[PDB]
Amino acid sequence: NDYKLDFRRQQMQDFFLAHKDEEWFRSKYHPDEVGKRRQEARGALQNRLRVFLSLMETGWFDNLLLDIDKADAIVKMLDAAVIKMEGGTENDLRILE
């Protein structure tokens, strides 16, 4: 007759009943929403992968190190990444100049 085990179990059971329908909780553990959110998360990550490889070949990391000497160049590179993440063409980058 363990009180601690019965308390942790009842707290867990009362938690599941309370947070059943909530979207944050469903997203973590419910098979359908975990499957849908992971595919959505993978698609967003695959978009970011193309942005990195675009910045590689275009040459935004060509002469750019992670040092505060080139703090201005990093901010410009970061803005160039967000433009490409939003589906921005090479014409759209010209406002950084």
């Binding site: 867990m12 938690f15 973590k28 098979p31 990195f52 901010v75």
Partner: protein, 318 residues
Amino acid sequence: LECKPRPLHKTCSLFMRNIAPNISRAEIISLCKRYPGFMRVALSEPQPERRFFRRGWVTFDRSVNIKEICWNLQNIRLRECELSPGVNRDLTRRVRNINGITQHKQIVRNDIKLAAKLIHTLDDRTQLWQNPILKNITDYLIEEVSAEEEELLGERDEKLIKVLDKLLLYLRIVHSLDYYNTCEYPNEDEMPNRCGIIHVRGPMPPNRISHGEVLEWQKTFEEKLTPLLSVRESLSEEEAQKMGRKDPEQEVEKFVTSNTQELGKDKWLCPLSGKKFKGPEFVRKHIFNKHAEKIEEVKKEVAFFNNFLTDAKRPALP
């Protein structure tokens, strides 16, 4: 003649301090979609200290007057929660320096190994692709020395730093993992600024870099990085049985017998369809064949419960 450039990096946004967990994204999206120039909604991870309340961020186009949008949404509740938003100003300091010891050879050589493992793990974890930046990556970790020439006759290293930057820029742009700070920004892709703050090497130490202090940095830094590759915790097979892991096929059998109700003698009415049967064996054949949509949902409910029950690092009250 070509079109106007679009400043997509700049985007003004709102900030809601307290959002209840009963409110979904669709309710906040549908509320703000009626306003012109709506883009996306972000919600932080709910914290148990505040009864699982989230922090919201509604992003908009930079063309729109955010101050008037903030005023219109001021006294508007959703379900029962006052949203009461404020204007989120832009990020002031985006390139933050850290300690300057991180440009030393031995730390740079060590960070290439750690950064490579972060990429190796996260590329398998998220399941992209092999990654071309990790081709012959162990060839930079090994030392090259003129030891034979010294035996007979008896700081900054730019080549390694260029290699490290490609790994850290990959981690930060793709996986949203700020390496030098040792932290993920998981919601960034929904948040107002898609790639905000990045952390950068310091200027240079004014005094000599000590012999043991290099080893102490490496020990302390890997200690900070270890939670980033944390596989999700799970209870043991006995401990899950104590807490009450529901069996899928057994719980489905309970659903059948509960629905297989006996109205009278040679009368077995089930409430799912509402049709009479002569015996309980006929009702089981009816539920399995015809109502195959319901028995899937019972298995999903059990898995939904078991995934929550199995997770040792469980969301619970403080």
